[PDB]
């Protein structure tokens, strides 16, 4: 077995220079983001295109809530920022749609927003793209945004069920074998193709899971350099940060960034 402590020592020894990180809703929660299960026929219709076309207001209700500059990153986001600032982050894969990774200062070239973003939008009819700012007043005002070209509904570039994952997602193909550490925060990775992505790291590479529970591919197909640190995600991260000797660095980073937010 490796312990958390062992992983921590690899990182401080800057021996892990190519950390691939996978994240999900377990890191949104601490920023206040409501869980997406809580009028719709069943909650998943919120990300279903046929239903959206029939009635887009529910979705746009949620877009209003999550639109940029409402929510702020939490200290788990900032830990990932710190990894990046140290030159240790190969890529960060997010299933979340709150865009808090980019607000935390991680550059877009280091990020894969696997479920899309509110940063931009697309006309559902003529496919004209829009910067997200261009539909913000409508969204903020509870009016369904319409295309100036064709009058079609303008949809934020959130990936809906059945729609292709973004282009950038295919960086996984080589990011995962290229990693010298896999970090999994706040997600199980039970859903394909994320599940299969955990298997794509090389045999010798540690996989460190920080999450409420042990779930998905790390439980079904365990490896001997897996480490699972189970509990509140934030507190698991606070523990790794201490084992790294980065506690004061984290404080100072968060203060500097909070000063800016």
């Amino acid at each position: 077995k490796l312990s958390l402590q062992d992983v921590a020592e690899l990182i401080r020894a800057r021996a892990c220079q190519r950390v691939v990180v996978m994240v999900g809703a377990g890191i949104s929660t601490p920023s206040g983001i409501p869980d997406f299960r809580s009028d719709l026929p069943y909650p998943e219709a919120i990300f279903e295109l046929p239903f959206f076309f029939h009635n887009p207001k529910p979705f746009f209700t949620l877009a209003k809530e999550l639109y940029p500059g409402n929510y702020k990153p939490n200290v788990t986001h900032y830990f990932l920022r710190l990894l990046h600032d140290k030159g240790l982050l190969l890529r960060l894969y997010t299933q979340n749609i709150d865009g808090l990774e980019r607000v935390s200062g991680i550059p877009a070239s280091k990020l894969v927003e696997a479920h899309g973003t509110f940063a931009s939008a697309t006309c559902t009819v003529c496919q004209r793209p829009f910067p997200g700012e261009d539909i913000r007043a409508d969204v903020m005002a509870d009016r369904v945004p319409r295309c100036p070209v064709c009058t079609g509904v303008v949809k934020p570039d959130i990936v809906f069920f059945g729609e292709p994952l973004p282009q950038r997602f295919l960086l996984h193909v080589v990011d995962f074998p290229m990693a010298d550490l896999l970090l999994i925060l706040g997600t199980s990775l039970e859903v394909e193709p994320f599940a299969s992505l955990t298997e794509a790291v090389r045999s010798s590479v540690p996989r460190l899971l920080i999450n409420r529970d042990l779930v998905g591919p790390l439980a079904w197909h365990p490896r001997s350099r897996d480490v699972a640190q189970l509990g509140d995600v934030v507190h698991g991260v606070e523990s790794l940060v201490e084992l790294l000797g980065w506690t004061e660095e984290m404080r100072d980073l968060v203060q500097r960034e909070t000063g800016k937010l």
Binding site: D35, P43, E44, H115, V159, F160, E192, P193
Partner: peptide, 7 residues
Amino acid sequence: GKVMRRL
């Protein structure tokens, strides 16, 4: 396609 799931 993004996979149908619950939530």
